[PDB]
Amino acid sequence: KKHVVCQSCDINCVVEAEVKADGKIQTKSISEPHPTTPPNSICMKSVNADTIRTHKDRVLYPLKNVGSKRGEQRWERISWDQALDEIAEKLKKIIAKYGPESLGVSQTEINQQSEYGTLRRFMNLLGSPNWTSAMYMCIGNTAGVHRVTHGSYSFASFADSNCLLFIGKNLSNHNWVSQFNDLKAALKRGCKLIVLDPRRTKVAEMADIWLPLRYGTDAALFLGMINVIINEQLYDKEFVENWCVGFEELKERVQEYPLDKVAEITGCDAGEIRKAAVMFATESPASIPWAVSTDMQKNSCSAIRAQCILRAIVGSFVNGAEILGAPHSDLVPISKIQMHEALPEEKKKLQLGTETYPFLTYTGMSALEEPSERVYGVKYFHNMGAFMANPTALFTAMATEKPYPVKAFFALASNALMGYANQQNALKGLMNQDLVVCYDQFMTPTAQLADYVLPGDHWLERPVVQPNWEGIPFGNTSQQVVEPAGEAKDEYYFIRELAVRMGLEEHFPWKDRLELINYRISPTGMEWEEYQKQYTYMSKLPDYFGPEGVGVATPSGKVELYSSVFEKLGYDPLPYYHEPLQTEISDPELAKEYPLILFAGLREDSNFQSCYHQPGILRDAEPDPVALLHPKTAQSLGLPSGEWIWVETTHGRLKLLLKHDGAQPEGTIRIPHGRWCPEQEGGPETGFSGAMLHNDAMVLSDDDWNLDPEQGLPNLRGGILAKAYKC
């Protein structure tokens, strides 16, 4: 029996695995008392993970495209050695012609947990700043906002909270089951629960207060709560006095958001919003667990800022409710391995997005350099995901060659075609590449567009030392269950082999991933054989707020309720809510043709993002891409529940199976993210196995009107109008 960090989704429950006599790997909830993962924390995605590891369609060998047009499905198996030789040769030619900045990378490291900083190390040595990640609108953006406010991304304590505030978070036995169990434990301790969700979910039913707000309006709801907490003086006067700046300015701002106005905006009742605010401030320690919905709105910046402000002012950073992370105290920081200082300033300045949405770039984050050196001993603190190219800028440079060409593109555990907005432009960008490399487990829609598809190992085939989002104040060890199948290799193998061919061997002394793991843990004096024997290693953290506290990694050293960085960048230093530019409020005329407010998302028990749609048990649990309409709404449109429809915005459309569902509020429509059809032939004739027909990014604009102005991420949750009609 092994303890393994499940990487079938990103919450990373620790499970137990065992190889049975017939070679099948059985996974189950950990039978021992685990320090972080509560009992009975395993879901169908994990239970059935071996059906993916052993799937007949898994790519186990390097494939070279031998067609005459990108996207043509004509593939020939080659060796790793030959693939790497050819990739390096072509990349050298591309870089000689277009500069190292012409290499773009989309990487989801949480899916791989294998490179330990060596990916950005490689890019920084080559001279490319053009790294991005689908986490540009999930956690990575949030960390930027947290950093300008209080220097580091915060973590909410389910164990210590006496009040939890949920934004969406449709937790269940198959959506972040460990956290589902954490919540249940909390409730039984007497912890109160406040749920903001237009959909009455199971967590909404469990809630002490359920606020059925209108899609997209969380920022307004939170401003209303801050109004109540400031005006009622329910805040922690000592923390505000000693550790915050800009409180008087914040106080003035929230007078713009009285409960009568917020009630009108949100569709919630004023008295309920007040109860929520009061409960949150008085039922300490009170936390707001990170939630995706507010990373995906036109008002995302303000909604995130407002959450940070709420936690700060009620005392959550000093009562155990919210913890400010750091590079792990026991380990060599990933940030240091990444060698951001090696990338020349000239190349940092070129990072795509610097000229449009600089906030999350090296340039936008630069005011945090000295503060980060001071507090964390790391000038370039790669907190969760950081120093990022803006995806719209990246795909636009790929597609148009402006402001300059990007001509090589690597997708590392990232179905990049489908992982952002404006999927048509991502396709155009990919079709204008001279080199595309896809490191994955399957012939995904993105891999279908590659010159080379390289087989990645699976989480049941690798050891892992955590944390692999730098900032998380603990790491769980993951044991290797089996050797990788076929010729699947680890992410560091790929990076090192390429680095050597690019002339960078001297900077990559670790001969394999195990040596790199041993380097990551080297300050402990242990090697991996000994290290893996303990489940969890907690990090020490700086003394932020004690009597001789060091404060936070912000320009002022204090919690910036009024953000100096935003002021600097020309953005509103304080949170606000403006109606998205495509709603029934901002555009009632457009709403005559497009009567539905759009929500793209709603995670499904049996799949993770675009993963696990291959024929099998998981696909069978939810086999079609499904639209959800309230029965009354569907009825009005003449669409029988269970019939195929198009859902169309001003940007584009996708095809879905209408299922009527009374929990979906009237006049709103759900579309899924990540849906495609791996059973189909690939290539453009099938829209890349249905990608072009069934993915939400087909209908999501990334014009400026649909971008968060400060972060440059796309709005997905409210703020967009749609129509639905029969196929």
Ligand X SMILES: Nc1nc2c(c(=O)[nH]1)N[C@H]1C(S)=C(S)[C@@H](COP(=O)(O)OP(=O)(O)OC[C@H]3O[C@@H](n4cnc5c(=O)[nH]c(N)nc54)[C@H](O)[C@@H]3O)O[C@H]1N2
Binding residues: 6, 9, 13, 43, 45, 108-111, 138, 169-170, 174-176, 196-199, 215-218, 293, 297, 413-415, 419-420, 439-441, 457, 462, 599-610, 673, 696, 717
- Among positions 127-166, residues that touch W ion (CB under 5 A) are 138
Give CA separation, 698 vs 174, 255, 352, 658, 672, in Å: 27, 39, 23, 18, 11
| Pick 60 or 292: Cβ nearer W ion | 292
Return d(Cα 25, Cα 484) in angstroms, integer: 13
Check residue 718 for interaction with ligand X (CB under 6 A). Answer: yes
- Among positions 10-29, residues that touch ligand X (CB under 6 A) are 10
Q: Which does 386 bind (CB under 5 to 8 A by kind): W ion, ligand X, ligand SF4, none?
A: none
DSSP state, 449?
G
Cβ density class 452-488: b for 16+ within 10 Å, e for less: bbbbbbbbbbbbbbbbbbbbbbbbbbbbbbbebbeeb
* Beta pairing class for 435-440 and 408-412: parallel
| Pick 37 or 297: Cβ nearer ligand X | 297
Region from 142-150, 174-182, 538-546, 677-685 binding ligand SF4, contact rule CB under 6 A:
174-182
Region from 9-17, 55-63, 306-314, 624-632 binding ligand SF4, contact rule CB under 6 A:
9-17
* Percentages of the chain per state (helix, strand, coil), in multiples of 5: 35, 15, 45
Looking at 4, 6, 318, 360, which residue binds ligand SF4 (CB under 6 A)?
A: 6
Per-residue interface string for the shown chain with ligand X, residues 195-224, x marking contact by CB under 6 A: -xxxx-x-----------x-xx-x------
Residue nearest to W ion (CB): 138
Return d(Cα 33, Cα 409) in angstroms, integer: 44
CB 436 within 8 A of CB 105: no
Known binding residues for [4Fe-4S] cluster: 6, 9, 13, 43
Check residue 88 for interaction with ligand X (CB under 6 A). Answer: no
CB 176 within 8 A of CB 186: no
Per-residue interface string for the shown chain with ligand SF4, residues 27-56, x marking contact by CB under 6 A: ---------------xx-xx----------
Looking at 122, 158, 176, 452, which residue binds ligand SF4 (CB under 6 A)?
A: 176
Element (H, E) at 569: helix 564-569
- Among positions 541-560, residues that touch ligand X (CB under 6 A) are none
Check residue 138 for interaction with ligand SF4 (CB under 6 A). Answer: no
Binding-site residue total for ligand X (CB under 6 A)?
Answer: 64
Q: Which residues contact 369 (CB under 8 A, 6 or more apart)?
A: 379, 380
Query: Active-site residue 10, yes or no?
Result: yes
- Is 282 buried (19+), middle (13-18) or exposed (0-12) by CB count in 10 A? middle
DSSP state, 489?
B
**Angle 270-282/259-266 helices, nearest 10 degrees?**
110
Check residue 599 for interaction with ligand X (CB under 6 A). Answer: yes
The least distance separating ligand SF4 from the CB of residue 43, rounded to whole angstroms, comes to: 3
CB 219 within 8 A of CB 580: no
| Pick 224 or 601: Cβ nearer W ion | 601
Looking at 287, 316, 444, 480, which residue binds ligand X (CB under 6 A)?
A: 444
Check residue 171 for interaction with ligand SF4 (CB under 6 A). Answer: no
| Pick 12 or 170: Cβ nearer ligand SF4 | 12
| Pick 176 or 493: Cβ nearer W ion | 176
| Pick 150 or 603: Cβ nearer ligand X | 603
Check residue 8 for interaction with ligand SF4 (CB under 6 A). Answer: yes
- Among positions 648-687, residues that touch ligand X (CB under 6 A) are 673-674
Return d(Cα 513, Cα 534) in angstroms, integer: 20
Return d(Cα 88, Cα 673) in angstroms, integer: 34
| SS3 state of residue 636 | helix
Give CA separation, 265 vs 187, 252, 454, 591, in Å: 30, 20, 49, 17
Return d(Cα 486, Cα 80) in angstroms, integer: 12
Check residue 600 for interaction with W ion (CB under 5 A). Answer: no
| Pick 11 or 388: Cβ nearer ligand SF4 | 11
CB 222 within 8 A of CB 575: yes
Full 3-state SS string of 332-370: CCHHHHCCHHHCCHHHHHHCCCCCCCHHHCHHHHHHHHH
List of residues contacting ligand X (CB under 6 A) = 9-10, 108, 111-112, 134-135, 137-138, 167-170, 174-176, 196-199, 201, 213, 215-216, 218, 291-293, 297, 413-415, 418-421, 439-442, 444, 456, 458-459, 599-605, 607-611, 673-674, 696-697, 700, 716-718
List of residues contacting W ion (CB under 5 A) = 138
The set of catalytic residues is: 10
List of residues contacting ligand SF4 (CB under 6 A) = 6, 8-9, 11-13, 15, 42-43, 45-46, 176-178
